[PDB]
Amino acid sequence: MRPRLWEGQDVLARWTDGLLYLGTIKKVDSAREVCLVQFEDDSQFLVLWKDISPAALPGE
Ligand SMILES: c1ccc2oc([C@H]3CCCNC3)nc2c1
């Protein structure tokens, strides 16, 4: 998988409004290339891998 993801990792997920929302990975599905993500409002959704990035930005 292009970005390495794992349970409990803090991630930034691109939503349908084009914005990045902070959340936490609760499960990883490398076969369907989605992850269960729980966001700041404690809501959970299946997010496509392509819309996910580590909240840790390269170069810090
Ligand atoms: C990708 C898929 C679903 C998503 O849901 C959210 C948050 C939007 C508003 C606050 N609750 C959840 N960001 C997402 C990114």
What 3-state DSSP class applies to 14?
Answer: strand
Q: With respect to residue 36, please indicate whether it lies within any of the assigned structural domains.
A: yes
The protein residue with its alpha carbon nearest to ligand 1, atom 1, reads: 15
The answer to whether residue 1 is domain-embedded is: no
| Smallest CA separation from ligand 1 atom 5, residue | 15
Integer-rounded Cα Rg, in Å, for the chain is 11
The structural domain count of the chain equals: 1
Strand-strand pairing, 52-54 and 10-14: antiparallel
Residue nearest to atom 4 of ligand 1 (CA): 15
Residues 13 and 49: their CA atoms lie apart, in Å, by 9
- Does residue 30 sit within a domain? yes
Which CA distances in Å does 38 have to 17, 41, 60? 18, 8, 23
Q: Look at residue 14 and tell me if it is in a domain.
A: yes
Q: Is the CB of 25 under 6 A from ligand 1?
A: no
List the resolution, Å: 2.3
CATH code, 47: 2.30.30.140
Q: Which domain holds residue 35?
A: 10-54
Q: For residue 37, report the phi and psi dihedrals to the nearest 5 degrees.
A: -125, 135
Please give the backbone phi and psi of residue 43, each rounded to the nearest 5 degrees, phi first. -80, 150
CA of residue 18 relative to chain centroid, distance: 14
User: What's the DSSP call for residue 45?
Assistant: E
